[PDB]
Design a protein around this motif. Structure first.
Motif, mmCIF file in Angstrom:
data_model
loop_
_atom_site.group_PDB
_atom_site.id
_atom_site.type_symbol
_atom_site.label_atom_id
_atom_site.label_comp_id
_atom_site.label_asym_id
_atom_site.label_seq_id
_atom_site.Cartn_x
_atom_site.Cartn_y
_atom_site.Cartn_z
ATOM 1 N N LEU J 33 1.052 -1.246 0.182
ATOM 2 C CA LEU J 33 0.321 -0.133 -0.076
ATOM 3 C C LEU J 33 0.802 1.289 -0.151
ATOM 4 N N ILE J 34 1.478 1.336 0.863
ATOM 5 C CA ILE J 34 2.553 2.445 1.064
ATOM 6 C C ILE J 34 3.657 3.202 -0.408
ATOM 7 N N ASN J 35 4.383 1.466 -0.617
ATOM 8 C CA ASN J 35 4.296 2.564 -1.918
ATOM 9 C C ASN J 35 3.537 2.459 -2.726
ATOM 10 N N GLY J 36 1.967 2.089 -2.652
ATOM 11 C CA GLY J 36 1.507 2.557 -3.473
ATOM 12 C C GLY J 36 0.365 3.672 -4.310
ATOM 13 N N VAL J 37 0.641 4.141 -3.077
ATOM 14 C CA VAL J 37 0.960 5.600 -2.785
ATOM 15 C C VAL J 37 2.013 6.449 -2.605
ATOM 16 N N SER J 38 3.088 5.858 -2.812
ATOM 17 C CA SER J 38 4.341 7.179 -2.552
ATOM 18 C C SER J 38 4.776 7.361 -3.717
ATOM 19 N N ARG J 39 4.840 6.294 -4.852
ATOM 20 C CA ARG J 39 5.084 6.259 -6.155
ATOM 21 C C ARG J 39 4.440 7.472 -7.485
ATOM 22 N N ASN J 40 2.871 7.010 -6.115
ATOM 23 C CA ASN J 40 1.726 7.530 -7.515
ATOM 24 C C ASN J 40 0.604 8.424 -6.435
#
Lengths: 74, 132, 59, 37, 42, 52, 224, 74, 74, 74, 75, 75, 74, 74, 74
Positions: J33-40
């Motif tokens: 999730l966190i990568n999935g919001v950090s790069r987007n």
């Protein structure tokens, strides 16, 4: 009575493999440290203690388990 | 600094040049990436998709035909691409589908024509997302 | 899909994208400037080491 | 030898000395309660 | 047995080292810093 | 028993006197020469600033 | 008299033996014995400046020094084989950690009063788990206390005892038949590497102590 | 009573390896830190406050099992 | 007879180490917090709540475990 | 009969670590999730219901284990 | 006393796979090593001493495993 | 046979934790699902069927384990 | 004394499965070896000796483990 | 001493699951070969000797595992 | 004397999970096969024989586990 010292010795047996978390753990830090310096050679001093710092965090936790073996050894 | 310096550039007319901006959204090879005020210095090749520019004002939406997004290490993001796009005016399905079937027919020809035909098939099927 | 392997180079890849966006232009606003952007008339002649020639091909 | 400078140790570092006294008195209770082992 | 012994002599050395290092051993080096910078700046 | 540990310590101190002490010698010498160099250069520089 | 109190005397004598006899007659040039404490001063300075980041940050710079050096020296003394345990008394070290933690609590409660318990709500959460993050912060609030000492001396209780028992192993290696003298060198190099790691479990553990209590002082003086 | 303290001793022996993943845990946090600051240099004093936070909470996993090891000793 | 309270001890011993999961778990919840926010430092103010969301109720299951051990201890 | 209650005590002990599947599992979802919001950063509100959906029908699996544990205690 | 050395032998048996993190551990360090020289060709003289640092006091932990398995076997 | 009910109870205990194979595995699918839709926004209605497809036939395997537990508790 | 050799034999049984980690480790080594040589054809047999070096004295741990199993037979 | 040959049998049983690491890792090297040749189709089987090398003397660990099971079994 | 066949059967119980990560390993090969062919569609005829070759005499080692589970059952 003839069992409790044998039980403490097998308790030292089972309390051993918790340094496995040491054996994995410090590993990836140095792995990350190589990937720390591969893609950026001029920042390595920045991470040369800061990697090994976490080393002493993980190592000591591995060095938790077997001394709990040792006072169970004695 | 707070915010970001945006420099949007096209071979006929650069749209934005040093404008302060909050958010950009742009299609890279690793997926759709949004870039905010500070960022890792990163070079992203731009697959032809949509770029959305949000500021203190609203977010303007562009179709974009591909290029390069480049984050200068003082957090200055430049986009270097080819085609601009209005809100929705510049694309129409009558010109899309009637040419697109001919392009799929060219995709069964000899190799150099068929490769460019398949590229245009992919671009029109990306434009289907602009058809939305 | 394997245009890097089989077809065009990457600048030519985005050039075909440019002709595709200019071909799917709105016919109201497909101006003369955009049709000027798609007016390819350059000719190339691959000379040889003995200053030989090919025919001029429309690129 | 070494030039003595009056550096602030009492008007800065009171609470750790306070906690040392408190742990000394709690250790008095402990070693008066847990030395009959 | 000797929790009082180790604890009390350790705390006495703690107070000794705090007041000792603070009054002597840190600013004796800070004088070296300020002296070098005052020569270099002039 | 414990003489084995002091024997390991003697081998370790032999390795230290072989390996570490010349490196710390070079380190302290480099820092010493650098400090003496900058400290003398500032003095010669404001000597020439007097001469200006 | 106590041999451990004598060890504290040895600590204070070496601490005198780090600056006083070190200083060649108060020279600017900073000689080779002084470069040691110079580098130690700078590696604690550049540490706790960027750690706590206070406008008044150096005020607690003395204590972080003297909490370092005691642990740095007392884990370079028992490294010599014929010694007794200095830092391996977990009662004394964990007692020190309890003193440090309770002093941190008293310092923050005198600085902030009621709002010192504003640490227990670190970040934004939805409603039904607001107190839960409190609870296992409070459960972590004294776990902050107990582990920090219970690390280091238990390392040292695992340290020197290690070099005890394996010595006995090499004592039980070399009293069987004379073929134990051939290729019996690799346990000696193994205990050599144990002492190599034992210098790490001294030095880097002391710096671990310093850096964790640096973070603890930052949290205790400033609320997030 | 010859068997109950033998049982609490081996029960402490198997309540040792709960630090196991924590021996991984803190380490892999630092793994990201070496992939953090060696990627982006000017974040060294930004993510390190939360990481030394996330260190200690990662101890809060694998420490209580260790003290489950301790008071089962008593 | 003595064994039925003795077995509680080893059941408490291995009925704690489920925090092992938490010992791996919340670690990467920080690590992809790091590897996330290293990539985009200005998203921290946006994601530092959500991370401490996904921390807490992925830790609390492990906070079940020793509690299940605890009354299995007591 | 005087043995089977100790067997159910250690049966509750051995049927405890299924929240391990909780303790890792849902945690790594928040990782992605966190990568999935950090790069987007614009796709927070699209994933976060879906992601928390992928919370529930994973974590309840681990929940199953401990209620099995309680029916091996009750 | 007919049982204690037998239980010590099985205790040395279960104190043997704690060097599991040996067999993975140092190995995956070398993994990044092969990565680190791959994506950075002129870094090898840099990395391999530090990497062998991350070898040595990463495998000695595993040594701890078998020395437990050596002592509870014998002593 | 005084022990076989205790044997089935503790066998149900060591046939319990197989849902770990659920509890990790299906989670990573949703993890990949995030790296679906956070990477490609126009893929959702493609994969959100398939991923929840990839839910069921995974976790049912773990369901197998605990239903074995039920027939190891009674059958 | 009729029991102790059987305990030696089952101890040799449990002292065997440590080759798990060596088999995973050398596989990860060859995994990064192929992944590093596919992104770098020009430098193959410069690294391959260091690769087989790390291979050899990474597998030496499992070598030690099964010879410990052999002497625990003895 | 009816216990000892049956104990050799169960010792052969616990000397089975060591090949877990082999059964993982001898496959994943070829998975890395997939990931390597899919990127770079030019060099496929010039690195296949390295792949089959890692294969053969990675599964030699599991060979050692079940031959320990053999020699303790019969 | 009735201990040996029941000991062989419980030895068949512990000779079971050696295919376990084999059930992982061949799986991730197909996953990596996906990570070849969804990325490079021009490599499928290259990779699909050899990878499924890398299937078979991988998981057959896992098959070895259950046939040992037969030959201690018999």
């Amino acid at each position: 009575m003839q069992l409790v010292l044998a039980a403490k010795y097998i308790g030292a047996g089972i309390s051993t493999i918790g340094l496995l978390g040491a054996g994995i753990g410090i590993a990836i830090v140095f792995a990350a440290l190589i990937n720390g310096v591969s893609r950026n050679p001029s920042i390595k001093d920045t991470v040369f203690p800061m990697a090994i710092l976490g080393f002493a965090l993980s190592e000591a936790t591995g060095l938790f388990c077997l001394m709990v073996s040792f006072l169970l050894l004695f | 600094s707070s915010g970001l310096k945006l420099q949007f550039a096209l071979p006929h007319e650069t749209l934005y040049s040093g404008s302060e901006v909050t958010q950009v959204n742009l299609p890279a090879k690793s997926g759709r990436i949004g870039v905010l005020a500070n960022h890792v210095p990163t070079v992203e090749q731009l697959l032809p998709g949509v770029v959305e520019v949000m500021e203190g004002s609203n977010s303007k939406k562009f179709f974009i035909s591909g290029g390069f997004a480049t984050v200068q290490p003082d957090s200055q993001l430049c986009v270097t691409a080819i085609e601009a796009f209005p809100l929705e005016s510049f694309s129409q399905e009558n010109i899309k589908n009637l040419l697109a079937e001919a392009k799929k027919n060219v995709s069964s020809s000899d190799a150099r024509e068929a490769a460019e035909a398949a590229i245009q098939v992919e671009v029109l099927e990306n434009l289907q997302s602009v058809l939305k | 899909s394997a245009w890097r392997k089989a077809g065009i180079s990457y600048a030519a890849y985005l050039n075909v994208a440019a002709q595709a966006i200019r071909s799917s232009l709105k016919t109201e606003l497909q101006t003369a400037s955009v049709l000027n952007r798609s007016q390819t008339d350059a000719f190339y002649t691959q000379y040889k080491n003995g200053t030989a020639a090919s025919e001029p091909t429309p690129i | 030898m070494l030039k003595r400078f009056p550096t602030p140790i009492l008007k800065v570092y009171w609470p750790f000395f306070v906690a040392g006294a408190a742990v000394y008195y709690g250790m008095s209770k402990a070693a008066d309660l847990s030395s009959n082992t | 047995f000797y929790f009082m012994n180790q604890l009390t002599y350790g705390f006495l050395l703690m107070i000794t080292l705090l007041i000792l290092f603070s009054q002597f051993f840190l600013p004796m080096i800070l004088r070296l810093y300020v002296s070098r910078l005052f020569i270099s700046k002039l | 028993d414990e003489s084995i540990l002091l024997l390991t310590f003697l081998g370790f101190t032999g390795l230290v006197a072989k390996y570490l002490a010349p490196a710390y010698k070079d380190f302290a010498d480099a820092r010493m020469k650098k400090v003496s160099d900058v400290l003398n250069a500032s003095r010669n520089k404001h000597v020439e600033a007097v001469k200006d | 008299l106590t041999t451990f109190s004598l060890y504290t005397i040895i600590v204070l004598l070496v601490i005198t033996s780090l600056y006083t006899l070190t200083n060649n007659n108060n020279k600017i040039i900073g000689s080779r014995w002084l470069i040691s404490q110079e580098a130690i001063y700078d590696t604690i300075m550049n540490m706790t400046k960027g750690q706590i980041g206070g406008k008044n940050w150096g005020l607690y710079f003395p204590m972080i020094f003297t909490l370092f050096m005691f642990i740095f020296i007392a884990n370079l003394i028992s490294m010599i084989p014929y010694s007794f345990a200095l830092s391996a008394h977990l009662v004394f070290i964990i007692s020190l950690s309890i003193v440090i933690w309770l002093g941190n609590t008293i310092l923050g409660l005198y600085k902030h009063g009621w709002v010192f318990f504003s640490l227990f709500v670190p970040a934004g959460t939805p409603l039904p788990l607001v107190p839960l993050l409190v609870i296992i912060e409070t459960l972590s609030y004294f776990a902050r206390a107990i582990s920090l000492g219970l690390r280091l001396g238990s390392n040292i209780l695992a340290g020197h005892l290690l070099m005890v028992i394996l010595a006995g192993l090499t004592f039980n290696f070399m009293l069987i038949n004379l073929f134990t003298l051939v290729f019996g060198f690799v346990p000696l190099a193994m205990i050599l590497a144990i002492m190599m790691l034992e210098f790490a479990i001294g030095i880097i553990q002391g710096y671990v102590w310093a850096i964790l209590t640096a973070s603890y002082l930052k949290d205790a003086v400033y609320l997030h």
